[model samples]
Target: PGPALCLFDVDGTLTAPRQKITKEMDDFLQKLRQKIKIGVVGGSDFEKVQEQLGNDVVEKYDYVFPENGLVAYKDGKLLCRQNIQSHLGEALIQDLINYCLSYIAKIKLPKKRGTFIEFRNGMLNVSPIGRSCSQEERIEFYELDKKENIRQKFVADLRKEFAGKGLTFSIGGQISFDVFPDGWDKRYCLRHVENDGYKTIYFFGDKTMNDHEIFTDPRTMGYSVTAPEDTRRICELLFS
Candidate 1:
């Protein structure tokens, strides 16, 4: 068969910032569909990913993995699913949220709208900004050094607190922390596809270096592209 093309990390890579899909991006995606298998691996909730892309764009793609490699979708169907590693009880999730809220108040950080604590099935997506915040504000806050580092430190503390429980946590994008079971990540997902007989793989992502070191490993077979906030380079690479 021809080379198999796959993509991961949807946000800044596939859609632009704030989940906006531009016409150029839409057209590029249209062209992408004709040549290879296209997929999305991201830290978003699966349904939210679909919603952001809209049904039409999703229909044009092949698969999607969301919740930071904990879930997978193919041909509009759920394929594989996993939960965060926290093994958090309902009480624990509440406690975590409460802790974050108290800390945020204590720090007197700018409070954005939305839920500071998100419970998507079992995966915990802790956004420093409230979920109700505008997408632009969310993106901006995530990139804020003060906000990002604070969230990072919080995850680090949680990791230490939960060490040896077989749980795993990683930071993604600007303001999200992905907590999943040990050994669940992009590399894990890549290996899954490879074992299933896919040979030529291609990945498009924004923060390939930040998360699980999947793209950093040379053993991975594929053409990989990193999309920055600016699409100029991406346009040159894709169209040229």
Candidate 2:
């Protein structure tokens, strides 16, 4: 294999959304790494990524990009990181968070928990049902949202309100969406690896809104996968 990099999105692509990595998928990734450089980029922060991928996730992959590459690690060492507060400024962030809180307050779900607005270094994750919901509640909210298009409607409203603000709203995961600067999607990770002489960069992702920008990015050959099994199937066909 020529100098190639295989990057993956964590939530739906590598593991079930908000779930742990299965042994089969983990084993497959290790085998695939033998053929090319492997990395993982996810919207969640490093701690959440670690919780799902493993405690030593940074050591397992050549690159681990959490918060959509706002925090990056290469060879188990910190490469670089960026914060949303610095990029967007405090005033705009406060406005965004306040608006989201008000909106969530009005929308009535079957059950509401805590941590509706998660402020990350790279982006703000807005969850309608709250991140503190139990696993069963997570699935329940996901199903309800699917039936009602709750997150979709929320993103549409945010997009209109923040139209000229250079902000991007992405609907990802089972319970929430992400808000960040225009160019701070998964593609941000590419800037770090661009000059590394990679002849081919393969990106696998599941969310249309979250990964479309990076998956369809000119620099990457994007693969849309439905589940971990599909990701493995494609990797086996292409790399194995």
Candidate 3:
């Protein structure tokens, strides 16, 4: 085995702004598949990750870590499941959802995407765009800065509110709040890889800047690629 290289963060990093996978990106991934092991870590769930990357693209990767590293899938099967029993407790999770729903209703935001209050086997994702939002709308909502601070503050509050409750919360991507068990994130999940003596690690992500506590950890070694919302710029970075 050579130096191990793993990729993290999917949506805007692997796919384009609107969750569209370009032919060029596909080719780049194919090339990467040949040289080093590739994995995707994101704040999405397994089904959502597959929907964005597609089965064909996923077939070429070594693993997929979703729900912000709360789950791991390999060889088309789930290898590990984290936060299996709801970290905030089912009662608190429901309370938080109710609170957020009331907040959204009071604000009268479009609720455009219908909001996702999903519990992925214990990992919770609260998406403002609603799970039904189109990829484009999701991107637009994420980029625009509407409610960005509010969302951040909300997550912060949740962290404080659930401090000793064993739940971990962080904002990922643009408009989603990712809740998982304490001590888990993309990096934590990455550390569990057998390594097998592999060396070089490359991580590509748009949210690398969003969650500093996770990405800024000193133990991680990788060339971090940060892509803006521009597709061409992202393509250039991937290929160049």
- Which number leads on TM-score? 2
TM-score of each: 0.59, 0.71, 0.60
lDDT of 2: 0.88
Compared with the true structure, model 2 gives a TM-score of 0.71
Positional deviation of 195 in candidate 1, in angstroms?
A: 3.0
**Highest lDDT scorer:** 2
User: What lDDT, from 0 to 1, does candidate 1 have?
Assistant: 0.61
Task: Sort by TM-score, best first.
Answer: 2, 3, 1
Against the unseen true structure, what C-alpha lDDT does each candidate score?
0.61, 0.88, 0.63
Cα-based RMSD of candidate 1: 6.1
Candidate 2 lDDT over residue span 38-112, tens digit each: 999987888899888999999879899997788889998999767888888899899999989998898999889
True lDDT of residue 23, candidate 1: 68
1-240 per-residue lDDT for model 1 (tens digits):
445656656776766566656667667676757766677777667567766676564576777777655676668666766554245555566655676667555444455666776766555667556566677777667667454487777778777766665667767676667665555556555654665456566565643364445665454443444443334355346533
Best-to-worst lDDT order: 2, 3, 1
TM-score of model number 1: 0.59
Candidate 1 residue spans exceeding 4 A from truth: 1-3, 85-118, 125-161, 170-178, 207-212, 217-240
